[PDB]
């Protein structure tokens, strides 16, 4: 009978893959905009001795549009393993709701399946995907990832687009910093028992709920751990123009008068926002 | 307004008349005993306490049944000739009167009770179960 004041939780958060996207605000629930498809051929070096001229093929144009989406929870009560006194379980539910909202919003904007959701740029499959090269070993072409590949992926981006950062799981970076050469040396940065370069200079933002092709470091591979075919390894894009997140109204909470019969206090809440993709060309995805 | 008094003090069958059941108290620090009768008794009955260790084959199953040694309090007048702990239900206990008990010395990871030999016919009319106090994990 000596209750303490510690409230150990042990629950994890994701990374915030939102500040990279193009943040936009609007009051109305439906927006629209313009697009320049492809200027197109509009002539040729007219040959000599011809005061005439020529025709050809111009480029299309598309005024596009999008909507927002909702996310609302009711959560009632009864008020006597409640209001009496152990803890303000209400605040617990409020915090859990906000955390759930953030995590589900991030998961949606990453993998949102079309209907009533911001179409997840992963499942869109219109970002270019670069499968990796198979690896022969003891007469077996077992899929596997190899240092140069990563570099070849990060350098293969069209430079004239602009600065394109990259995204990956901490498991992938751990597998990467643990690359060992034929000389048993630590293939990458080597000779400090570790490898801690500031990823901001190395233009890499890290996450922990990305598809993690190196599942809890268990999935590596020589013959059974094999990194497994086609598995999102990482991605790279200029997210200031690749994706966009539109914000309409934050979470709101209010008591629902009516239905509440002085014991079942019924609270109502919710939020509205959405997202979409730009042209899914400024950015690619490294897969097995 | 009965609370969910099973998410603490969880009870488990220990002796259903003709079968014992090793119960894990590792998560708990405190555990009592509840004895109940179902019919009329004939003579007094005796029970021997056992405890079990994590089997080398599996760290989540009970091992063998090691007898529990009796720890004496102050002001003790008799000790079991073996020095091993044991309980006994006296005669003339009508089957609407629960009985409580507790050994103050835990050892092992599983506990168990068995009807001491020669006093096992009446054991059929005896029911034993145990509740706990702890979680710790």
């Amino acid at each position: 009978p000596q209750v303490l004041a510690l409230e150990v939780d042990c629950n994890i958060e994701c990374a915030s893959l939102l500040d990279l996207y193009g943040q936009i605000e609007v009051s109305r629930s439906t927006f629209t905009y313009m697009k320049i498809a492809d200027y197109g051929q509009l002539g040729e070096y007219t040959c000599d001795a011809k005061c005439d001229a020529e025709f050809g093929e111009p480029g299309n144009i598309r005024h596009l549009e999008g909507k927002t989406y909702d996310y609302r929870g009711v959560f009632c009560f009864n008020r006597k393993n409640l209001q009496e006194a152990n803890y303000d379980f209400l605040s617990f539910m409020i915090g859990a709701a906000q955390r759930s909202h953030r995590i589900n919003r991030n998961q949606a904007l990453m993998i949102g399946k079309g209907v009533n959701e911001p179409k997840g740029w992963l499942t869109e499959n219109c970002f270019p995907v670069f499968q990796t090269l198979p690896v022969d070993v003891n007469g077996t072409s077992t899929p596997a990832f190899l240092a140069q590949d990563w570099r070849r992926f990060v350098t293969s981006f069209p430079a004239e687009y602009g600065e394109a950062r990259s995204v990956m799981h901490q498991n992938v970076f751990g597998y990467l910093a643990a690359m060992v050469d034929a000389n048993g040396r630590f293939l990458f940065g080597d000779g400090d028992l570790t490898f801690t370069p500031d990823l901001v200079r190395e233009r890499i933002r890290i996450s922990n709920c990305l598809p993690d092709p190196t599942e809890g470091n268990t999935k590596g591979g020589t013959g059974q751990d094999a990194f497994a075919a086609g598995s999102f390894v990482a991605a790279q894009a200029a997210w200031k123009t690749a994706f966009y997140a539109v914000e309409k109204r934050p979470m709101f909470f209010e008591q629902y008068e009516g239905g509440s019969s002085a014991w079942c206090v019924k609270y109502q809440f919710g939020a509205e926002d959405g997202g979409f993709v730009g042209c899914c060309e400024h950015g690619r995805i490294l897969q097995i | 307004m009965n609370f969910n008094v099973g998410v603490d003090f969880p009870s488990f069958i220990a002796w259903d008349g003709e079968e014992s059941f090793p119960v894990k108290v590792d998560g708990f620090n405190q555990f009592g005993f509840t004895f109940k009768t179902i019919a009329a008794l004939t003579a007094a009955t005796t029970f021997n306490i056992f405890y079990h260790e994590p089997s080398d084959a599996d760290p989540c199953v009970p091992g063998p049944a090691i007898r529990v040694p009796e720890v004496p309090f102050c002001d003790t007048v008799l000790l079991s000739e073996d020095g091993l702990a044991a309980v006994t239900l006296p005669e003339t206990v009508t089957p609407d009167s629960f009985c409580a008990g507790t050994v103050p010395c835990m050892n092992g990871q599983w506990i168990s009770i068995a009807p001491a030999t020669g006093s096992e016919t009446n054991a059929a009319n005896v029911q034993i179960t145990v509740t706990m106090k702890g979680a710790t994990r």
Partner: peptide, 28 residues
């Protein structure tokens, strides 16, 4: 109504393996 709730008493936490980059032979 009665939503009978659960928790674990014990478990058998195994040892997750730990595979790390095998050496690369060479492409070709």
């Amino acid at each position: 109504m009665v939503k009978l709730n659960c928790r674990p008493l014990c478990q058998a936490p195994t040892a997750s393996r730990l595979v790390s980059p095998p050496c690369f032979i060479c492409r070709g």
